[PDB]
Scaffold this active site. Structure first.
Site, short mmCIF file in Angstrom:
data_model
loop_
_atom_site.label_atom_id
_atom_site.label_comp_id
_atom_site.label_asym_id
_atom_site.label_seq_id
_atom_site.Cartn_x
_atom_site.Cartn_y
_atom_site.Cartn_z
N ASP A 220 -55.16 -72.96 -44.38
CA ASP A 220 -53.77 -73.06 -43.78
C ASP A 220 -53.63 -71.81 -44.70
O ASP A 220 -52.43 -71.01 -44.77
CB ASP A 220 -53.03 -73.78 -43.56
CG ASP A 220 -51.98 -72.82 -42.72
OD1 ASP A 220 -51.98 -72.46 -41.46
OD2 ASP A 220 -50.70 -73.30 -42.02
N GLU B 19 -35.76 -57.29 -45.96
CA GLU B 19 -34.87 -58.23 -45.21
C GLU B 19 -33.86 -59.10 -46.06
O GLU B 19 -34.42 -59.76 -46.88
CB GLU B 19 -35.51 -59.45 -43.90
CG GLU B 19 -36.88 -58.04 -43.18
CD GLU B 19 -35.42 -57.89 -41.87
OE1 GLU B 19 -33.70 -57.94 -42.40
OE2 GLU B 19 -35.82 -57.29 -41.00
N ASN C 60 -30.04 -60.18 -44.05
CA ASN C 60 -30.21 -60.79 -42.93
C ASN C 60 -31.14 -59.65 -41.73
O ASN C 60 -31.16 -59.40 -41.39
CB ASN C 60 -28.99 -60.02 -42.21
CG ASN C 60 -28.14 -60.92 -41.13
OD1 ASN C 60 -28.86 -60.76 -39.87
ND2 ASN C 60 -26.95 -61.73 -41.69
N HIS D 111 -51.41 -70.75 -39.14
CA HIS D 111 -51.19 -70.85 -37.91
C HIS D 111 -49.47 -70.35 -37.95
O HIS D 111 -48.94 -70.58 -36.94
CB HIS D 111 -50.38 -72.84 -38.08
CG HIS D 111 -49.66 -72.79 -38.84
ND1 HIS D 111 -48.78 -73.48 -39.46
CD2 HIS D 111 -47.78 -72.94 -38.40
CE1 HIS D 111 -47.67 -73.37 -40.25
NE2 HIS D 111 -47.12 -73.09 -39.33
N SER E 255 -42.23 -71.69 -41.99
CA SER E 255 -43.91 -72.10 -42.36
C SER E 255 -45.00 -70.11 -42.55
O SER E 255 -44.28 -68.69 -42.76
CB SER E 255 -44.59 -71.44 -40.88
OG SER E 255 -44.73 -72.96 -40.65
N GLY E 256 -45.12 -69.97 -43.77
CA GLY E 256 -46.02 -68.94 -44.13
C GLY E 256 -45.54 -68.24 -45.37
O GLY E 256 -46.14 -67.42 -45.84
#
Ligand SMILES: [Ca+2]
Length: 223
Positions: free
Chosen positions: A84, A52, A54, A40, A177-178
């Site tokens: 998903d 990463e 910040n 999604h 998400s993910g």
């Protein structure tokens, strides 16, 4: 992540941010060339950001690498979020180092009751909106299948598991998400869905990565 804690810079070195002009989803680096995320989270035009902390400040340990290919699972159903999962190939391999590292794929499926680390740059409020700049973390246990199905009747497939706290207060959320759910040092889940965030009786629902290892391995051997 609602009810979490600031991870600490680069303590989750497999966590990626997917960027299409702005952070929009997490992912997990599984080798120098490939990210696992949620189907999604598909968008065309994705830049993977590794190293990463910040996401709004270039701090010096980042690698920004465009995706060359994205591969949504062949059986992804966007209505139910069954399957998903997506793979993203990087245009060039990441330089693996102490801040940018892969996470292992599982051999066995994780167990109910196992505490896992979930992370991301998603909303930190159950009611309302606040997006952190630095990466947030949450430890949450896998719930039994029966509890999961009771929470979401008619909605949980064998490719999903619940994790979190039925009393509410602690969960992943929009923008996570993910991203990864790591249990016993392996990638066991992907942040997928849930009814709101951190609400009572509505735990998070996560893609069951152990069901996808043979698809992931044959796809990366072929692309
Ligand atoms: Ca940064």
């Amino acid at each position: 992540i609602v009810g979490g804690y600031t991870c600490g810079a680069n303590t989750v070195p497999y966590q990626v941010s997917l960027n299409s002009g702005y952070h929009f989803c997490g992912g997990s680096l599984i080798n120098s060339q490939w990210v696992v995320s949620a189907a999604h989270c598909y968008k065309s035009g994705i830049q993977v950001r590794l190293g990463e902390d910040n996401i709004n400040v270039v701090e010096g340990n980042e690698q920004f690498i465009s995706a060359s290919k994205s591969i949504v699972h062949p059986s992804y159903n966007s209505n139910t979020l069954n399957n998903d999962i997506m793979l993203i190939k990087l245009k060039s391999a990441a330089s693996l180092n102490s801040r940018v590292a892969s996470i292992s794929l599982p051999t066995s499926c994780a167990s109910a009751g196992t505490q896992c680390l979930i992370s991301g740059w998603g909303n930190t409020k159950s009611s309302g909106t606040s997006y952190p700049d630095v990466l947030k973390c949450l430890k949450a246990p896998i719930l039994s299948d029966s509890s999961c199905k009771s929470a979401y009747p008619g909605q949980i497939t064998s490719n999903m598991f619940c994790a979190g706290y039925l009393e509410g207060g602690k969960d992943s959320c929009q923008g996570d998400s993910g991203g990864p759910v790591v249990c016993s040092g392996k990638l066991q889940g992907i942040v997928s869905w849930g009814s709101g965030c951190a609400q009572k009786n509505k735990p998070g629902v996560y893609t069951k990565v152990c069901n996808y290892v043979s698809w992931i391995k044959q796809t990366i051997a072929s692309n």
